[PDB]
Amino acid sequence: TATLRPYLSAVRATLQAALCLENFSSQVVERHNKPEVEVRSSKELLLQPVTISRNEKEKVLIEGSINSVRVSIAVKQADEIEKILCHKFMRFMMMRAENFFILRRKPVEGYDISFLITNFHTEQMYKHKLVDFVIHFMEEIDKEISEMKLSVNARARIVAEEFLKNF
Amino acid sequence: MSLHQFLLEPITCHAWNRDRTQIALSPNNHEVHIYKKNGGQWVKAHELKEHNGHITGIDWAPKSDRIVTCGADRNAYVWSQKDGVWKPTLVILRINRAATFVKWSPLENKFAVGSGARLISVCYFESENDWWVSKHIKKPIRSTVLSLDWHPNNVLLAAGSCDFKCRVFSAYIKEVDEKPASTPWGSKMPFGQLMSEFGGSGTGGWVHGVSFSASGSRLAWVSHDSTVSVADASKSVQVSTLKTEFLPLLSVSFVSENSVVAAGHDCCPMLFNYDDRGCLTFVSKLDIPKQSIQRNMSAMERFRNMDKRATTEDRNTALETLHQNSITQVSIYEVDKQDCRKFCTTGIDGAMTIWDFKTLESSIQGLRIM
Amino acid sequence: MILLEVNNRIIEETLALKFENAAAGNKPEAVEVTFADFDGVLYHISNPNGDKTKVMVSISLKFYKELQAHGADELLKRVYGSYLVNPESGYNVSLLYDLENLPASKDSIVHQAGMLKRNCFASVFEKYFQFQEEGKEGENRAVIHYRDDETMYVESKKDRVTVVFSTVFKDDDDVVIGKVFMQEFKEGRRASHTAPQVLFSHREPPLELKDTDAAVGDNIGYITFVLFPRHTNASARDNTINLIHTFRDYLHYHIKCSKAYIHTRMRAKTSDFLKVLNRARPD
Amino acid sequence: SDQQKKEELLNAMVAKLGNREDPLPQDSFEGVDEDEWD
Amino acid sequence: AGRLPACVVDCGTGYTKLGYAGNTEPQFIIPSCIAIKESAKVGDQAQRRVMKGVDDLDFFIGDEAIEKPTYATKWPIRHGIVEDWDLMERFMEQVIFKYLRAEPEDHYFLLTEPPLNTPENREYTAEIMFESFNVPGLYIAVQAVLALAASWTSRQVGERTLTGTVIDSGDGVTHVIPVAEGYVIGSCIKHIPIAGRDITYFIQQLLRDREVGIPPEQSLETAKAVKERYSYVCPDLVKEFNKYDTDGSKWIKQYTGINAISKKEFSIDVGYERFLGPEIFFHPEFANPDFTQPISEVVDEVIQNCPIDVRRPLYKNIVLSGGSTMFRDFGRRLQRDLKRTVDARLKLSEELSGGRLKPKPIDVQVITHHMQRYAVWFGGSMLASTPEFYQVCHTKKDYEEIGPSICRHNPVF
Amino acid sequence: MDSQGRKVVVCDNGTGFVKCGYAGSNFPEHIFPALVGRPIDLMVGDEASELRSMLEVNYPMENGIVRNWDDMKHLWDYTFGPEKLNIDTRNCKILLTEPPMNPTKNREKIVEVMFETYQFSGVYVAIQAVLTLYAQGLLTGVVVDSGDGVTHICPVYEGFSLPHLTRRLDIAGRDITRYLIKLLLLRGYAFNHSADFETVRMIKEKLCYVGYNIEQEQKLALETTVLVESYTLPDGRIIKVGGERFEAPEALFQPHLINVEGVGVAELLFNTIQAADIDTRSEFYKHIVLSGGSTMYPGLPSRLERELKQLYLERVLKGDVEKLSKFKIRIEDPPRRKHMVFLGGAVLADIMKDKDNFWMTRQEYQEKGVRVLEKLG
Amino acid sequence: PAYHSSLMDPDTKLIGNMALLPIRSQFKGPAPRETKDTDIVDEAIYYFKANVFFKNYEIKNEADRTLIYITLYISECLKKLQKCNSKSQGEKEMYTLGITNFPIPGEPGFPLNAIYAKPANKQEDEVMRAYLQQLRQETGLRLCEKVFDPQNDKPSKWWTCFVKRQFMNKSLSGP
Amino acid sequence: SARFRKVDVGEYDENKFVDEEDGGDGQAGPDEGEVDSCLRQGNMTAALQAALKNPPINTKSQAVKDRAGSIVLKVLISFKANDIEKAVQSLDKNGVDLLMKYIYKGFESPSDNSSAVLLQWHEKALAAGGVGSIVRVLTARKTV
Ligand SMILES: Nc1ncnc2c1ncn2[C@@H]1O[C@H](COP(=O)(O)OP(=O)(O)OP(=O)(O)O)[C@@H](O)[C@H]1O
Numbered sequence A: 001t002a003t004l005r006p007y008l009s010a011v012r013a014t015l016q017a018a019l020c021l022e023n024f025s026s027q028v029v030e031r032h033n034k035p036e037v038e039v040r041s042s043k044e045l046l047l048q049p050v051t052i053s054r055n056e057k058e059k060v061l062i063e064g065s066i067n068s069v070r071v072s073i074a075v076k077q078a079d080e081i082e083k084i085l086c087h088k089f090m091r092f093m094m095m096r097a098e099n100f101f102i103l104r105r106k107p108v109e110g111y112d113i114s115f116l117i118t119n120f121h122t123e124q125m126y127k128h129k130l131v132d133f134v135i136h137f138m139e140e141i142d143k144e145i146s147e148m149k150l151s152v153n154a155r156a157r158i159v160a161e162e163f164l165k166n167f
Numbered sequence B: 001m002s003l004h005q006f007l008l009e010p011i012t013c014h015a016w017n018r019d020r021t022q023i024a025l026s027p028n029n030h031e032v033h034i035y036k037k038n039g040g041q042w043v044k045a046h047e048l049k050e051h052n053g054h055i056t057g058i059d060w061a062p063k064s065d066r067i068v069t070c071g072a073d074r075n076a077y078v079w080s081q082k083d084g085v086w087k088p089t090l091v092i093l094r095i096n097r098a099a100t101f102v103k104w105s106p107l108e109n110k111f112a113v114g115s116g117a118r119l120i121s122v123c124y125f126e127s128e129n130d131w132w133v134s135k136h137i138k139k140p141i142r143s144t145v146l147s148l149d150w151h152p153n154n155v156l157l158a159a160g161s162c163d164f165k166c167r168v169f170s171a172y173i174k175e176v177d178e179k180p181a182s183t184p185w186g187s188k189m190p191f192g193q194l195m196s197e198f199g200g201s202g203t204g205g206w207v208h209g210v211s212f213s214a215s216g217s218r219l220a221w222v223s224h225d226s227t228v229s230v231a232d233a234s235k236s237v238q239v240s241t242l243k244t245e246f247l248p249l250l251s252v253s254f255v256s257e258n259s260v261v262a263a264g265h266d267c268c269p270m271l272f273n274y275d276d277r278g279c280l281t282f283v284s285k286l287d288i289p290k291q292s293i294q295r296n297m298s299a300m301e302r303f304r305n306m307d308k309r310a311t312t313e314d315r316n317t318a319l320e321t322l323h324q325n326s327i328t329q330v331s332i333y334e335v336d337k338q339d340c341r342k343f344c345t346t347g348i349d350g351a352m353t354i355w356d357f358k359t360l361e362s363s364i365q366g367l368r369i370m
Numbered sequence C: 001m002i003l004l005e006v007n008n009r010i011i012e013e014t015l016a017l018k019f020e021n022a023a024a025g026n027k028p029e030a031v032e033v034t035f036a037d038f039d040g041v042l043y044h045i046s047n048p049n050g051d052k053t054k055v056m057v058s059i060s061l062k063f064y065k066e067l068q069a070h071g072a073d074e075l076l077k078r079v080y081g082s083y084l085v086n087p088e089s090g091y092n093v094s095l096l097y098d099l100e101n102l103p104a105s106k107d108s109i110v111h112q113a114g115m116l117k118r119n120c121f122a123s124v125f126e127k128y129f130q131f132q133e134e135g136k137e138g139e140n141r142a143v144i145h146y147r148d149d150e151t152m153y154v155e156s157k158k159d160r161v162t163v164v165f166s167t168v169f170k171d172d173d174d175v176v177i178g179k180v181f182m183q184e185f186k187e188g189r190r191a192s193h194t195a196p197q198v199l200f201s202h203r204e205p206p207l208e209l210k211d212t213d214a215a216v217g218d219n220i221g222y223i224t225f226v227l228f229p230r231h232t233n234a235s236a237r238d239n240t241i242n243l244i245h246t247f248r249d250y251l252h253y254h255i256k257c258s259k260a261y262i263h264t265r266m267r268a269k270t271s272d273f274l275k276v277l278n279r280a281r282p283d
Numbered sequence D: 001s002d003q004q005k006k007e008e009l010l011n012a013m014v015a016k017l018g019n020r021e022d023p024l025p026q027d028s029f030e031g032v033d034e035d036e037w038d
Numbered sequence E: 001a002g003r004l005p006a007c008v009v010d011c012g013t014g015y016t017k018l019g020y021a022g023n024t025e026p027q028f029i030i031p032s033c034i035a036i037k038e039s040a041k042v043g044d045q046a047q048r049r050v051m052k053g054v055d056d057l058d059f060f061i062g063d064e065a066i067e068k069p070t071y072a073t074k075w076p077i078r079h080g081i082v083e084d085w086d087l088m089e090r091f092m093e094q095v096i097f098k099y100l101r102a103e104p105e106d107h108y109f110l111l112t113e114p115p116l117n118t119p120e121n122r123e124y125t126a127e128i129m130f131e132s133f134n135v136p137g138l139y140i141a142v143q144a145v146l147a148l149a150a151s152w153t154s155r156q157v158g159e160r161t162l163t164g165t166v167i168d169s170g171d172g173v174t175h176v177i178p179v180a181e182g183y184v185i186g187s188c189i190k191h192i193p194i195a196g197r198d199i200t201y202f203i204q205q206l207l208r209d210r211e212v213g214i215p216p217e218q219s220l221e222t223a224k225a226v227k228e229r230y231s232y233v234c235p236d237l238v239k240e241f242n243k244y245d246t247d248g249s250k251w252i253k254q255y256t257g258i259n260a261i262s263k264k265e266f267s268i269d270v271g272y273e274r275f276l277g278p279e280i281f282f283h284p285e286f287a288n289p290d291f292t293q294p295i296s297e298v299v300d301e302v303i304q305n306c307p308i309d310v311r312r313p314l315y316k317n318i319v320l321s322g323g324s325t326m327f328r329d330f331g332r333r334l335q336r337d338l339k340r341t342v343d344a345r346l347k348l349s350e351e352l353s354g355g356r357l358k359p360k361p362i363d364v365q366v367i368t369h370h371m372q373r374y375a376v377w378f379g380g381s382m383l384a385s386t387p388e389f390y391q392v393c394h395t396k397k398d399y400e401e402i403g404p405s406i407c408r409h410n411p412v413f
Numbered sequence F: 001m002d003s004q005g006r007k008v009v010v011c012d013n014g015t016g017f018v019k020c021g022y023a024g025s026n027f028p029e030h031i032f033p034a035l036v037g038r039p040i041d042l043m044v045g046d047e048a049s050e051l052r053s054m055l056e057v058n059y060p061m062e063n064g065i066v067r068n069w070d071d072m073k074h075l076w077d078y079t080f081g082p083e084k085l086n087i088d089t090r091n092c093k094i095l096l097t098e099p100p101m102n103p104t105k106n107r108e109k110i111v112e113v114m115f116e117t118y119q120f121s122g123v124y125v126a127i128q129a130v131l132t133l134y135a136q137g138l139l140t141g142v143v144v145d146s147g148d149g150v151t152h153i154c155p156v157y158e159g160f161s162l163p164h165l166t167r168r169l170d171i172a173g174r175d176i177t178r179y180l181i182k183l184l185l186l187r188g189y190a191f192n193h194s195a196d197f198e199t200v201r202m203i204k205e206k207l208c209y210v211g212y213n214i215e216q217e218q219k220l221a222l223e224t225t226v227l228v229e230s231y232t233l234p235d236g237r238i239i240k241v242g243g244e245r246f247e248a249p250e251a252l253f254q255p256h257l258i259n260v261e262g263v264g265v266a267e268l269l270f271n272t273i274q275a276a277d278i279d280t281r282s283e284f285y286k287h288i289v290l291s292g293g294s295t296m297y298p299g300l301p302s303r304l305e306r307e308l309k310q311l312y313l314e315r316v317l318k319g320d321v322e323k324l325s326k327f328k329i330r331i332e333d334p335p336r337r338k339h340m341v342f343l344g345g346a347v348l349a350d351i352m353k354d355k356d357n358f359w360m361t362r363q364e365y366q367e368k369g370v371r372v373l374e375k376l377g
Numbered sequence G: 001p002a003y004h005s006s007l008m009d010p011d012t013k014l015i016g017n018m019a020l021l022p023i024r025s026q027f028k029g030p031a032p033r034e035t036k037d038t039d040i041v042d043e044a045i046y047y048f049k050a051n052v053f054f055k056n057y058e059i060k061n062e063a064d065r066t067l068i069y070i071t072l073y074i075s076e077c078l079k080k081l082q083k084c085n086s087k088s089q090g091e092k093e094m095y096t097l098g099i100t101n102f103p104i105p106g107e108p109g110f111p112l113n114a115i116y117a118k119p120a121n122k123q124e125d126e127v128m129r130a131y132l133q134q135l136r137q138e139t140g141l142r143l144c145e146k147v148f149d150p151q152n153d154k155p156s157k158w159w160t161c162f163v164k165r166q167f168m169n170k171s172l173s174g175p
Numbered sequence H: 001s002a003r004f005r006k007v008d009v010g011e012y013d014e015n016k017f018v019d020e021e022d023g024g025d026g027q028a029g030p031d032e033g034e035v036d037s038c039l040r041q042g043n044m045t046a047a048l049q050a051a052l053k054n055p056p057i058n059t060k061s062q063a064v065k066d067r068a069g070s071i072v073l074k075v076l077i078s079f080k081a082n083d084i085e086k087a088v089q090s091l092d093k094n095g096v097d098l099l100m101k102y103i104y105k106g107f108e109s110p111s112d113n114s115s116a117v118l119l120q121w122h123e124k125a126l127a128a129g130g131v132g133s134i135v136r137v138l139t140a141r142k143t144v
């Protein structure tokens, strides 16, 4: 509780500095625009990777380049029902990745979800609205998972009492 | 602080004519639109469609009225006006990568194109057979050239690139130019000679913008690690560097002998001072926040509102600066580098802004530009 | 709905339509219907040798030899009587209805025709309640292989009747959701005090089934029902038999309905994220 | 192997379905007279 | 109980047909409506109720959904296209576990699709079938090939091909679809916006104009019964009016209905609407003021836009389908109008050629078969009963490693 | 312009278009389509093409070689008429082009039709690769041509074509269009092979490209949604094209995807260059010129240079890495690939206009007949 | 499609773009006498029950304009026959309907001004008005026996169900 | 067939970008004795100012950087919550940038309750130094 707001403030301060993008054409293959964090051909166009950790489980990894940025999020998972609901919810969002425009189809290993943002998205939208969407997404996931868990338990009690009444 | 919203999609680059009555700009596609001021409104006057790729550079000569364009299709065109119709002419560049930047010479007899094939192309006009020929500067460039500037004696050139260095080259062509004189930068000027190389050791930032002064003996450049640097050639070529506390800057311009105006990802122009002793200091932001943002929404009340945001933090729906996105180009609008009174800025949000020095002197307390 | 039904729907509608057509004196029509049910039971409704005045219903079960050892023929003879005939080829139990000799009341015949499978399973429970009523001891347990991997054990004691189900969950999340549901079943005697006692074990068999070759594995779970003589008398045994044999399908039905409710719940959050992302454009 | 399985399935469709010579269900209804349908 | 048959489900705008494979007729035909409880406040998505208890299981599908007090009736499908996926999933819950009574982990499944379907709808249907109910197999089929396969029972063994034109008419939009060698030519499918609802509305407004004594709540069911029981297609119009005016004792029928609220009987006379019902297929400007083109010109414009080498097999095989094409003497009228249009075009070409070109006369056939009302279900049922079907159908394993992209493309029959 | 006052006319006869102009011009004067129309009397040229619905159409020339001779004669008297050129056929010099690997009987028939029927003063025919290298300003090189029927590789040395080294590969743009039709059918969209050729041709001209490294493009296709583009059909439906954009032009390098035996274009180019003489191999590797309609894909010369470098590493140096820096190649594509053949023919007609040995004379045709054609070499 | 007349003979006279067809009547008028059994009024009564549902009519001849005018007037007859209950005041109603005037073509009250050609001079106007009045009275007297049913002496339900339908969404009386 | 396609010839190119190195390996980092003495006598500000001397930015050995990070994060987790902002304001710009580099190195391997202390130090260093220090962290070629 006390660690939540400094964690989100540090993540917001780190994402503001890494979202300064620019249009750039490929110097290896002629007439190509590629995201430089994925191809990794030229080593002078990459920045240092950074991470922010709240505890031993929750962390955020940020990797940058001249025209692209990649954000990987690890989500708090307490027990078995929470991690299977988290796995179902992340699979449900990553199937519909063509409607979001900033989502990867598969996450980076060791993490749960990844965002890939290029310079066309920050040409089409504002920067601070994208930062606000990332912070709002990270806030809403845990409340959603807790409400789903409480709904499952409140359903199961009524089903058990309805079966044992008529016997 | 005059804002005009042209269009919603971003503006890549812009150019003015001699009398500052017409403007030419690219609407993030393969066409060039020329707008003319009629009465008190801007109307579209001409459209130029020849390229097959993204337009990366437009320049307009003040005397001869010719427009050079370069794009990402490895091509360059020179446009001239005949009977109210603009006609193009192809320039052979002999490059295998995309082109990034184009600048005219001060005497309008050659032009320089910086491209991504680790070279700089200098193009002039051959009139015996009537086409534009080119020459190449290659060594020791190792990456993509991002910016260019011309010395006022029509010989020297300055370049910045992605190998964290800023270089000064000599571009002297015997068929067009005459014999130059001596400079504090150097004394021996063949073609392609490296005069000076600058850059930090171990601290890597991409150089986005370079600029010369009015007299031509001082150089300034900006980088990606939030640093502004000024090199002086007369005092045995010293370099002064200032580390700012803001987002990186993408443009730079000398407005006098001792004043630097810059802009970038913080959406507002800022002013820097350079004295004769060699100290680079930060003076002020030139976009003072509107009409105080109405005493900054009542100074005591926004301090209590920051206590209210310490309770419930919510985000600002519209930024208080006159540009809602980044600024990519700063240009001088009134007279020249010797006497500057107004300047123009363009940006990603699709707006054009004209600023005046006298109104900013009158509004901002204790502000004095020289 | 919450509770599952007992009687079939195809047999009742088909026989009601045929009896309503035969009551009005209209011309009869041919029929040839083949279908299935829960737990791998086959059905067949046809005409014997092309005769249009007779209808014939037949059933097919894998495990009829185990149910015949506990005396399922006499219960079917007592329930149906003259409608029971020799079985069809490839089938176990066969009935026969003649359309020219129907009685005036037709709801009860259709209702007894709908409950053929419950009348097949009822004989083991009606046998083993009588041992608890008579006070016998030392009788062997009843082992029913009602599926390929699942097994029902019935045992009788002095004051208790023990029914043990063995079940296999096919997916990994179903084990967790079934653990939640059986925890709520185990705790659920706090309101009703006449409720029977339900016990649950995971990955290991219970103690009294140590002698049998019960499987040990991660997916396999064991469910124990304890029944008292307030439920096994001669006036409240019908709803007991009607409820205890439709338990596994009830559990898996509620597991699949919970997963469908979860998939319903995710869509509103996805639509809200899409609206918040689409508001950010400068259109 | 889409094509080989599909042509074996089509040969199963050809060898499977029989023929009927019963009158159509439209013939039981009443309609207009026959001889002016020309 | 060694092998269990597959389940065949065909959904639609008006009716849903469901049963087991290997049979000739479907076991259930139900209306496609769902009654849900809407005791909450109207027009508030935030106040749309959290199911604290089991309150999403309080609904009724099928014929029990029609006229239930304190319930709201919803129709999830507009024109063969699913608009609400939650109501479709709750529909399939009571389809599987109540009517069919089949355990979904032991049976294969066959479903149908609209003719112009995006792959995203196939991915959503595969998600609903594989993630919630855990079926071992799923196959999504094209309706025109199933109708063309079901039309083979009136045909000899040497003439069974898979090239033809399918005219489909139900409760939505009439489709004209060309099929060449088992693949649908997708750029030539045409639509006519006339179906059984427009015919029922036209008969209802004619009965509102003429007769008296009908209760206001039971006009639509009376018009539906008059349409289904007394209707035919006439060759000419003024001769039928002469037949009805000269001899009214033979051609005028009577219909008797029962009032629901008073348990009384009413009787009406059925006259001019016996033949004026189905004539809006051939004269669409009688009811719809926008569409002014008959069905035969639409069929000729479908066939004339096809490639040239398959143009003559398409005329030789025209297959009727759907429930709205069950009127008497439909195919004779369609064949006569199509032959008149074709022969007018070739005599105009022979006049303008001046003896230079002598094209052969073509043969036009319209096929009426036995299984016309349930053709798509019959084709799916005869497809699913073969042992070769299990090698073509997808598995849950290919959904597990490869993903939802296996159900975007099916092996097209 | 010569001393005798007989003008020099450059006429280029491509399959899609016929262009004509004078010697020394930097742009063609007259452009027509090649078409013969018959009403259902005989309109040839531009005026058959606007009035398209009345006239049944006929294309006389297929893949650069003429199929119907009288239709080409009507094309020639349409071009040499007063409405377009207005020239006297007895007082003109004419230069013509020919496709490579041309059979000799066609060339003899073309020379017989020019010398006997129209009675031209001077007739020359030249191979288009020499005209392309004259338009570039070079003399020695290798020309790779890819159109709609076939793909040709031909080396030109000292201004003359080497006949025994010209190679042919039977892969062109229609096979790529058919492969794109099959790949779009594998995603669930309904298409037909005969009714939907032009739409998939416009999709192929708009969206496809050539990938540099295959595993990087496949990783980007199966992990990110960057490559997904949207296209609008003429009916009104919107389709989404993803990873087929690099998979469709891969049949040029791997011919076994389209069930055609053989090798790719890079192995064919390496075996063509390496079969020549040893001392002239360094001149051929530094002058490679791309031309044709199927060579306009992005990323083609980088992939060609990479495959040539890998083949030279494997089969010459046999694993030595240190000598790879000495190997120098350069593949040049023109940025002016509109009318290169006409410009090369105009330069060749301009510079070689007054010398006697170039033009074939009518008097030697009257003396000899078909024996003048040995003076081309 | 729609049904057209077939009584055109090129010896017939024209009043503008009308056709001066013969009629069988006892009323005075400028129309010639008819020797044959059929005429234009019986064909209009014959084709009224099929022509009233159409909305797009294509002109092929000159007699079709006269057929369109009689078909438009028959709905105005059927509006007056709705309210009536016995025969003899039925003919007394239809005589007073036939006496009163209507807007001729060339006037702004006429609905089909685009197709119908305006008359030129005054005797053409007099001949046209007398011809339309004779056509009006004759089709009223012919419709009086066809509408009424003799066994009950009431208007028939089969004829009075065609009141609300309009031919090409037009009306002679208008709103 | 395709044996030649497995060889990557792009990294044998002469014109690729090669990083430039300067300085030897003689920088041993900060010394443990003086900061241990300043921790022993209780001078926290002198311990922080002596811990930030001699950064090992040129040595390519890993163990010197690991022991320097061990001493710096050993000093940083032994402060009270109210003595942070006095110690932050005693530094110049280069000390703020070096402290931000050590804080962002310290998030790699969390243990016990050090992350809350590092978040408080990150908040005070962000309040003193601005957002340009994070950009100078991200664009550094030689890392501590
Ligand atoms: N003689 C008839 N017999 C049965 N139905 C008839 C008849 N005449 C008309 N109909 C109409 O047929 C309709 C049934 O259409 P159908 O069952 O094909 O609908 P659907 O579910 O939309 O089908 P589809 O799957 O082909 O889209 C009903 O609305 C009914 O009024």
Ligand SMILES: Nc1ncnc2c1ncn2[C@@H]1O[C@H](COP(=O)(O)OP(=O)(O)OP(=O)(O)O)[C@@H](O)[C@H]1O
Pocket: F014, F015, F016, F062, F063, F064, F146, F147, F148, F149, F150, F173, F174, F201, F204, F205, F292, F293, F294, F295, F296, F297
């Ligand atoms: N921008 C483009 N990208 C890819 N393919 C293209 C492009 N433009 C044209 N093509 C293809 O190139 C071919 C046309 O080539 P070209 O213009 O040389 O034709 P041609 O003169 O008829 O051919 P040929 O001389 O070989 O008979 C067609 O297959 C066309 O689809």
Ligand SMILES: [Mg+2]
Pocket: E012, E013, E014, E080, E170, E171, E172, E173
């Ligand atoms: Mg339908």
Ligand SMILES: [Mg+2]
Pocket: F015, F147, F148, F292, F293
């Ligand atoms: Mg070509």
